[PDB]
Amino acid sequence: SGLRSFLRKKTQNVIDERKLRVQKQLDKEKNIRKRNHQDVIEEALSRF
Amino acid sequence: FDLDDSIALLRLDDLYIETFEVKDVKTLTGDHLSRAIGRIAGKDGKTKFAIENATRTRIVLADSKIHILGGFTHIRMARESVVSLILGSPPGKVYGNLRTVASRLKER
Amino acid sequence: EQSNKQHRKANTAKKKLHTQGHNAKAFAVAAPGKMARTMQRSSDVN
Amino acid sequence: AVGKNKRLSKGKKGQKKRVVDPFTRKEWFDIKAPSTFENRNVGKTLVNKSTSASDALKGRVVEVCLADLQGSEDHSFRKIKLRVDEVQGKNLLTNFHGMDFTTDKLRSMVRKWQTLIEANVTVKTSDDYVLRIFAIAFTRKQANQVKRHSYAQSSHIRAIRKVISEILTKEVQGSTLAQLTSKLIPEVINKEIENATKDIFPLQNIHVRKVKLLKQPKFDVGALMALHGEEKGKKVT
RNA sequence: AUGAUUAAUAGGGACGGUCGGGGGCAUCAGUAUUCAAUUGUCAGAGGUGAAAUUCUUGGAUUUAUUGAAGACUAACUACUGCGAAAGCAUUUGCCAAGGACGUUUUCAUUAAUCAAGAACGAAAGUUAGGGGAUCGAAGAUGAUCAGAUACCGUCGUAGUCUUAACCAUAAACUAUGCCGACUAGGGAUCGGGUGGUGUUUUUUUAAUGACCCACUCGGCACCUUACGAGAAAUCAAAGUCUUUGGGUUCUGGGGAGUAUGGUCGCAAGGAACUUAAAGGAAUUGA
Ligand SMILES: [Mg+2]
Ligand SMILES: [Mg+2]
Ligand SMILES: [Mg+2]
Ligand SMILES: [Mg+2]
Ligand SMILES: [Mg+2]
Ligand SMILES: [Mg+2]
Ligand SMILES: [Mg+2]
Ligand SMILES: [Mg+2]
Ligand SMILES: [Mg+2]
């Protein structure tokens, strides 16, 4: 206990935070997969 | 601070916020600093709530940064108890003094 | 309820032998068993 | 403590009588900013009337937010110091003296889980104006990053610092201060630092934190008038 | 010029690109403290739980433009990094050093533990110079009112800094000898390397990054469990299938008092007497 419980709390929060971030990336990649599945001046400047 | 506590600033006209750091009281580093924060909060936050109830204030303990919301006389009373905890006073001794001042607060 | 566990601070039997100016180990008999038998008898004669 | 119970002090014995209101003798003066800024009117100041008034005026420094001078909140967090150099008919002609950020903005950018990169260079303009520039940058995490932090190795930091010093030195040397101030307002310097240091490591919140004026050459009224863009009197009878 | 075998997931050396708040010498910056110059205004400023010394109408405190001195590197700062430990956070350059990684390079037992014997060793402290801003043992002084604020305020010696030597002590901690082998799962991070992939990239100046996934060495750590251990707290070691042999160094056999046929130490100096007592108290009594 003491200081050691507090340090445990921080690591668990970071671990929980990482899970949320990773799930967001997986969700986004699924959207990209679905998206992939489904003026003269501007064309001259499309490369920029 | 909690929203309902923050509303007190709108409702009343004589509530202020006092702010200070742990390093201002004493140069604590490493585990010594972390233990000091735990001493202010106490187990389950009981020490922080004891100060809040006794002095009629609200305290936010953001790492080494302490903010106290309440009346001018009240926040000074809360500040002294917090500072004693930082200097090393055990929570039990601070709790006793809180009971003494808490008694005085009612009679007046 | 504030309790702090006490600090444990740190003359061996060997040093007791050398406490005198001389080394007590260096003045001993060859047969201690014979000595004890003879001391007890001589004490009774005295 | 003005109470009667307060113990008497030695200094209370003899006190000068207040017999003149100082603002009776003060005279108001209007401060004008260089042409590099959109809003020239930057307030007014006061001085004791000449018995001269100009001597107290010269060397006076006033600091004002860029938002007022440019009329846009995008510069709310940046302050510009202007120093009085010439006086003409209650108009105080001022020149650039320095630049700095508000403390609240500086504290906002500094955050945990990232590396703080700060670089400084002492360099002179083509006008022989010696000045010191401070730059600040922070690392950022990529779009697909999963690590909590975005720390950069000291090799990257030293590489980024070298690039920043080259850009700050290059622009100041190949420019006048009036030109240099013209660069500060649109923050083109920061965008240049971004692109140059980018391949080394992604960065965020790249800004020129502060500008100091260490030395000045001989004052030139002719140049000052050109920056601000003489008058006959009226017969008194 | 000429006799032997491996090349140990032993060791040493070499080479390659790295990595580091590792070290020494210079160098650059940053506000802050104190002081000083100029500047505007006028009665307080300071400090405490409350006050008093103290400073102040020759202008204190406060304001603005500067300068000088000596320290120190905030935020970034994290259960992250380096070093044998003590310790080490501004920039740039120089000097040498170093762990890990990569290697189809080299030597070939050169090793482990270590009486004897050697280098470094926080803070404080001793000798002799320098410096002396901040804080500050000692000393002086204000106040001695009130128990949550109950020891505070002002000046401040030695010291704090540095140069050349001494001192060698810390709760100098895993409160835990070293070397080697083996015995569980999990994913976070630092350094190196390998492969894939697609974003940020970008172009014959050159030069090489960031992120994601998988793997692999080395490291600071962490979480869940031990078919093991322990009385227990707990332990990936404090384990090695009922009682015991992988190698080697050191060490052992709490809190209060009582007395002493013992040992060693420890200073300075050249005159009472009253009635015992109502011989009293008293706004209160007789
Ligand atoms: Mg080999
Ligand atoms: Mg090498
Ligand atoms: Mg003044
Ligand atoms: Mg690091
Ligand atoms: Mg820094
Ligand atoms: Mg000395
Ligand atoms: Mg230590
Ligand atoms: Mg082992
Ligand atoms: Mg890796």
To the nearest whole Å, the CA of A19 is away from the closest chain D CA by: 10
First to last CA, chain D: 57
Token pair in block for residue D34: 């260089």
Amino acid at the residue A11? T
The span from the CA of D210 to the CA of D122, in Å, is 12
> Is there a domain that residue D157 lies in?
yes
Name the 3-class secondary structure at D97: strand
List the nucleotides on chain E closer than 7 A to a protein CB: 18-21, 28-31, 39-47, 51-59, 64-66, 75-79, 90-93, 148-149, 171, 175, 188-192, 198-202, 207-213, 222-223, 251-255
Nearest to D65 by CA among D100, D104, D114: D100
The single residue listed with the structure tokens 């109830």 is B53
Taking the CA of residue B29 and the C1' sugar atom of nucleotide E128, their distance in angstroms comes to: 38
Name the 3-class secondary structure at D51: coil
Q: What is chain C's length?
A: 46
Chains near B, with 3+ CB pairs < 8 A?
A, C
> Is there a domain that residue D127 lies in?
yes
Resolution of the experimental structure, in angstroms? 3.0
State the CB neighbour count (10 A cutoff) for residue B76. Answer: 14
State the CB neighbour count (10 A cutoff) for residue D124. Answer: 16
The span from the CA of D64 to the CA of D102, in Å, is 11
The span from the CA of D99 to the CA of D82, in Å, is 9
Angle formed at CA C36 by CA C31 and CA C42, multiple of 5 degrees = 120
Nearest to B64 by CA among B105, B104, B29: B29
> Is there a domain that residue D16 lies in?
no
Name the 3-class secondary structure at D38: coil
> Is there a domain that residue D76 lies in?
yes
Amino acid at the residue B66? I
State the CB neighbour count (10 A cutoff) for residue D184. Answer: 20
Chains near D, with 3+ CB pairs < 8 A?
A
Judging contacts by C-beta atoms under 8 Å, the chain A residues touching residue B34 are 3, 6
The single residue listed with the structure tokens 């709310």 is D76
Name the 3-class secondary structure at C17: helix
Token pair in block for residue B73: 């006389």
Taking the CA of residue B27 and the C1' sugar atom of nucleotide E161, their distance in angstroms comes to: 21
Taking the CA of residue D20 and the C1' sugar atom of nucleotide E52, their distance in angstroms comes to: 36
Strand D26-32 relative to strand D91-101, pairing: parallel
Question: Considering its fold, how many domains does chain D have in total?
Answer: 1
Half-sphere exposure for D137 (CA within 13 Å, toward CB): 34
Element (H, E) at D61: strand D61-65
Strand partners, D139: D203
Q: What is chain B's length?
A: 108
> Is there a domain that residue D236 lies in?
no
Element (H, E) at B61: strand B58-62
Element (H, E) at D54: helix D53-57
Q: Tell me D73's DSSP state.
A: G
Chain breaks in chain A (C to N over 2.5 A) after: 38
The span from the CA of D34 to the CA of D229, in Å, is 9
Domain span at D119: 24-229
What counts of helices (H) and strands (E) characterise chain A? 2, 0
Element (H, E) at D223: helix D221-228
